[PDB]
Symmetry: D2
Subunit: 417 residues, 4 copies
């Protein structure tokens, strides 16, 4: 069966899935090869992803490859109910995902997914893989391998490995070049600001925007905030990215110093409680806080709730916390991934590459069944490079190639002066 | 002895060396530790570097550490004669380097350097190390290790390794994070445009500027060309950087298509004959070509000379090649590293980090004498990270550090939802 | 009476009106004074504006001042039905505005508005003023004066004046410094991209975006498109803005050349048939065209409809036209101003200044009745400057002030050598 | 006679003058017409300009037109001695200009220039016109008219007019669209940074740069500082440019707040004592201060000299002031316009338009002698626009032209619904 909001939304989901496919040409080619080669024939698969038009196109590709797939939501607020309905009604793919579902429903959906007895698990944040290892030790004989879509998930997998419980292959999709160089940076840079603006309609120009973290996501958010006319502050914990942010023209300072100055705060660290009650207490009246890291725990909303004398919903996706002194803190999307909670996530152009990696990583797991060491594996270089070749070609961009003499010069070392 | 232009220039060199030191605080701390610990006592050292105020401060640091050093020019056009004179007259460091010296003088200087019988060779482009391996097999028992400053040199060292002749440790200074993330990118981005403008006084705004290569240097040049108002075209041979350039807002195309459009061409590829006679023949009348890769071979100037009916020097560092149809091609700095030939190279702020790596790499070689495998070694992570910590501190920038609970969250994998 | 979609939407409208007011502090101050001084007591007023949360705050300020106002939509597609419901239900202000109303309904609303016998007309695009002068010459004795919000309307007023029929005072709100320096530039720059992204979810980075016109709006749209990673082409008819665009780093060319290259076309010229059938014929398959000028006539959609062999809606606000050769053209918002048709228009921060100018322009007409010549009048400098001073204060920015010594220097001509 | 440093520099001057002419095609066209029509036959002319390769091309165009010209320096530090030598030796044009001349020599040169009894005075900063009106009332019958190149001079002319002593026509060259939209913005933006970098070699990326003034010059300097990776602070006295700076992404604050934060200070206000002792007192150790306004009086250097306990030159164009508390302030170019004092001023591409305006303004004064009122006159629109059309053509850029149908639409007011 399935567990969705409204199956009558399927026609609208189909229209939007097909619209998104227009900028997923790499995944389309993979789908067309999968439909002939059937790499997943006889394989059961669980996907824990954001239920978007882009994930739909991925599920359609795995289905064309023969996968017996079950899809559940990676986050209660990111689900697109029309997409869920189209996958069920048009493709017969079980989806357990309702926008705005409560925590008990999420956890029940994880339990249903694990009862599918998957041979492959595609995860986004590593919730299902962690539950599998914790609660389903008897099922590990089913697992051919897993994949992980996002940075937070890769961190949890390293913790599982160092703890000694990562006893199967896990594909590091997030760290492929054609994943986090584009998705994490250019995707999050546009879609994060998109979610902020759809929720608040705020003018970004002239605002001070504090970006916590200057990794791939932070670089993208800061770059686009700057492009929209914001004054950008960056916080960090490591010196190499801090120097980069300064040489990119941004102010770098500790969060305790930024807290007095920011009009908008955006967390993209992967870590817990980056924005804290001692920061809330000194923020400007009306400061906006939101999160684009995988988990809402980057903002200590539990503490905010007890500092505040009152909380009100003042717009879709927008809560106003009023403190005893009468100042307000605005929270978007209850601290959930603001690009997916208040908008539609990354454009399909970058998910084409992220989800091409997902599809080919699953294929890599199956074709190497019984042959991979336990632990984390990076995406093979030749796969990563081929995705980039196909994407560049699909964008209509042509580049150069070395001549035979240029190749010879590379291998000569006596040639200098 | 020494071989320099004019030792009466020493006072001016000293003034300029001390000016440059103001933004080399990391190297100063290393120098002050070196002067007490004397890591290089009894060690002979050859440096093949650009003879600039920044290299001078490096040589002063090695001298304080006890090194018996001899300095020669990495390039005939990059030498600063006042610096050469100050090093000889004020520090007693033999310098063999005359701005504008001919090719025979360069090669004689290399021979003199190798007769110093160095135990350590600091190289920039790998000319001296290649000559050592080619011509001085009997001297290899002297070598404790070598270092290489630039990307072109790292490529030659890989070729030496694959050929089986890299029989000693070579430190990869260029690829340290605190080297090519800053020097290669932000340094070249500013200093390349600096050299173009000092040579030509051209307005960059409104010009089409073709950047060949989108590695660390190409990213920097394109970013600053854009910042100065230029329309930027990027050429490449690999899809991952080509997609980056497009998502950074630049036009990507093959050089044969760019050749018709560019007002200024800048090569930063590391490869041979990237700009070719078939490109010259279709360039706009008055197009400017220059090179910021280590070797002038990136532009096929030999072919340009035979296509042209006439060449004239029309300004300092500036040659006009007139073709039979009357169109002109402008070449800056005879195709040598335009930032160092027509200006003063990178700012000392980034060379602080590059040359801190050089100093600590030499120390690493000495303290591990007889203990390192032959071949290339990367800069130890703890060294690289400490340089970044000290530089950030010296720039007056403070950042955050994780709390104990944040560290615990990193190592928990069961914590999701 | 009134003519709206659904009065039950009033609670949501009220909430959204209050949210927008958070960044309209200058208009709030004006409303509070109007509440005390009642400058519009006994005055009947018609407003033809986009029926948005920002217009609602203006209407509430006019209401506080005693104006007997009637509001109609400036564009069938920009109306926010929840705003219309709140103005009727909560303030008792007659609104004639239904999102998506047909042309006959819009025209009927204009007739009903003129039947209100306004003393003041606030117009956005000059439709109501033109209908008054063409059809209601017998009502001109009612008119104290009118105001005009946008550049297209000013051009119409100019033609009326040159035609001898602008026989009453008309305030040029659009050309106030605190209107078109911010609204037209920074507001359109952000909200045009907002509309495009809400409609299509497209990644802007790496796309070629053609901006027709490099006036206040074109400068903002090109600036923000570039900030979002686009490759930007600008078209023009006048050399001064064309040179500016080039020195701002954009590619300038005739539309016939741009037509082959653009992925997205945005018209902001104020002129008719800037994109024509001969341009559609050479566009890439799937090129997107939209308009941010006041009237959709900037794109020759009538010819596109005749050219095309079929048209279908492929997403909300998004139509696909298929040409007889099978290539497709995507049109957003039926060519109506894409920021208001597919999103929510400008942020309230800039509309604060635009509509402060509207409020004080209406006050100016009433306070100076019988002392203003017929024809166009600019916003008094003292008013324009006070709006800027108050907005800068409300943004929390402090600046310097001239000293007596500096004033003396300005008035001194003999000094300086 | 003449008064120059060294006539033997003429060959180098000639070469550099010819090089600069490559991007002065509009002035070349004007010179060629002047050579034919001789508009200045019998006219005596004085030019007080920066003695640069660009001014030389203007002087050559006036010479071609028959003008009996005499040229003196506009600033003791901007003079290019090789240019002065070429104008004397090759063209026989009297030049009174020595780079680094003292104040008494500058004043003597102004007296010699007025002794030429000019009919036309071209001024840059209005010193010669002010000296004429103060000291040479008996010569006013000589004057056909004057021109003024820069914003400071316009302000002086305004004060003269308000004082009743501007009794002849004076052409406002600075405020022509093709002058201050490009020269003041794009030229100053690039050449100010050029001067700073030539003097100091400092890395701009990661520095905090304070720009005083957000007019045409301030907009350009802030834009290019940001493009080079700086963190940019803007100071102002008027709210309209202050809001613009904020929405352009810069931090706006009073100079007293900026004084603690800046690494580099750049004054472009046109006003006196913008940086004062109370600012020097709180600057970072080693802060750099420079001026790109016409007169050095924007920085209170006289007070700094009194405050300081010592001063020394630490590099070409670079002085270190040491305060009694041991902190140091670095001054570039003795506070004289840093683009011309430490580099070569604007690129010839923008001076092409500025000096085309100068040439045609002088022609306008002669052709309209006896028909111009005393007081200031703007450049005729037709002249301003033709300069733009010719420059855009010479840049190789093509744009569109209105059709008959579009013209009809502009003049139609009844249409649009
Ligand atoms: N919302 C989206 O669509 C989306 C897309 C990709 C990734 N993500 C998430 O975004 C987060 C960041 O991912 P990434 O790829 O940028 O990771 P990354 O590893 O490249 O960068 C994270 C950066 O944050 C810094 N940081 C860590 N703790 C910090 C703290 N307390 N304060 C300040 N800086 C701190 C780190 O030093 C590092 O530079 C992850 O949770 C990832 O799963 C979200
Ligand atoms: N002048 C300076 O001060 C300075 C500073 C640092 C490095 N360098 C030199 O600059 C060069 C580039 O170094 P880097 O660190 O950027 O290297 P890199 O390895 O990071 O990047 C080089 C890039 O050029 C591309 N490329 C190679 N051949 C090409 C071709 N024929 N056409 C187009 N693109 C091509 C490669 O794909 C790669 O992306 C080297 O020669 C290096 O030694 C100079
Ligand atoms: N959607 C919005 O919210 C919004 C906001 C403000 C203004 N507007 C509208 O935007 C339009 C432009 O306003 P503006 O203030 O930028 O006007 P403007 O007068 O400042 O600029 C218009 C520019 O377009 C150029 N142009 C004219 N015809 C052209 C053509 N055929 N091709 C190319 N360039 C051409 C002109 O040379 C000029 O530079 C008007 O219709 C105005 O009412 C819309
Ligand atoms: N060096 C060059 O090559 C060059 C080129 C053009 C102009 N200039 C000079 O630059 C100066 C500025 O010219 P412009 O065209 O930009 O003038 P402008 O009138 O366009 O702008 C001056 C700006 O400075 C602001 N301002 C005035 N006093 C101030 C103060 N005390 N603090 C902060 N801001 C203040 C004004 O509000 C205004 O916005 C003039 O002296 C002009 O002659 C120099
Ligand atoms: N449109 C989208 N559809 C599906 N997943 C998305 C979308 N946007 C972002 N994501 C993914 O969500 C992850 C964060 O949980 C990111 O790693 C990213 O790949
Ligand atoms: N100012 C400078 N002094 C010394 N070396 C430099 C300077 N600028 C650039 N370089 C170095 O020259 C190398 C290229 O040969 C680069 O790797 C870079 O580190
Ligand atoms: N949010 C908005 N509310 C009302 N009017 C708007 C809004 N956004 C843009 N406009 C106005 O619409 C006009 C174009 O019809 C512009 O002049 C602008 O002032
Ligand atoms: N290269 C140059 N040659 C001559 N005048 C210049 C140059 N650069 C700037 N100026 C002028 O100097 C004036 C300031 O004194 C500016 O108005 C500008 O037009
Ligand atoms: Cl494939
Ligand atoms: Cl150390
Ligand atoms: Cl008021
Ligand atoms: Cl002419
Ligand atoms: Rb080689
Ligand atoms: Rb965790
Ligand atoms: Rb049709
Ligand atoms: Rb003065
Ligand atoms: Rb003193
Ligand atoms: Rb019209």
């Amino acid at each position: 069966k399935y567990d969705i909001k409204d199956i009558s939304l399927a026609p609208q989901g189909r229209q939007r899935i097909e619209w998104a496919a227009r900028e997923m040409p790499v995944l389309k080619q993979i789908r067309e090869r999968f439909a002939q080669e059937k790499p997943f024939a006889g394989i059961r698969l669980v996907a824990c992803c954001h239920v978007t038009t882009e994930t739909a196109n991925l599920a359609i590709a795995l289905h064309a490859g023969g996968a017996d797939s079950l899809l559940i939501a990676s986050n209660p607020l990111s689900t697109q109910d029309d997409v869920a309905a189209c996958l069920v009604a048009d493709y017969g793919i079980p989806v357990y995902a309702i926008k705005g579902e409560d925590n008990e429903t999420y956890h029940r959906h994880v339990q249903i997914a694990l009862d599918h007895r998957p041979n492959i698990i595609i995860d986004d944040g590593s919730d299902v893989v962690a539950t599998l290892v914790q609660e389903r030790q008897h099922q590990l004989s089913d697992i051919i391998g897993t994949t992980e879509e996002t940075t937070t998930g890769i961190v949890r997998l390293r913790a599982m490995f160092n703890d000694g419980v990562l006893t199967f292959p896990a594909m590091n999709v997030n760290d492929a070049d054609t994943k986090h160089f584009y998705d994490n940076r250019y995707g999050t840079g546009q879609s994060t600001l998109d979610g902020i603006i759809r929720a608040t309609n705020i003018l970004l120009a002239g605002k001070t925007i504090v970006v916590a973290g200057y990794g791939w996501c932070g670089k993208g958010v800061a770059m686009r905030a700057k492009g929209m006319g914001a004054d950008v502050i960056v916080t960090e914990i490591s010196p190499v990215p801090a120097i980069e942010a300064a040489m990119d023209g941004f102010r770098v300072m500790p969060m305790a110093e930024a807290a007095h100055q920011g009009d908008i705060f955006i967390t993209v660290t992967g870590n817990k409680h980056v924005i804290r009650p001692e920061h809330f207490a000194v923020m400007k009246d009306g400061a906006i806080v939101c999160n684009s890291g995988h988990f809402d725990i980057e903002i200590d909303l539990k503490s905010l709730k007890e500092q505040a004398k009152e909380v009100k919903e003042v717009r879709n996706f927008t809560e106003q916390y009023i403190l005893p002194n009468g100042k307000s803190i605005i929270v978007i999307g209850e601290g959930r991934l603001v690009n997916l909670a208040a908008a539609t996530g990354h454009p399909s152009a970058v998910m084409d590459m992220s989800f091409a990696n997902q599809a080919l990583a699953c294929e890599h797991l199956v074709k190497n069944k019984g042959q991979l060491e336990p632990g984390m594996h990076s995406i093979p270089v030749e796969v990563d490079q081929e995705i980039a070749r196909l994407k560049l070609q699909a964008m209509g961009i042509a580049i150069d190639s070395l001549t035979p003499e240029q190749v010879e010069y590379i291998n000569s070392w006596a040639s200098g002066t």
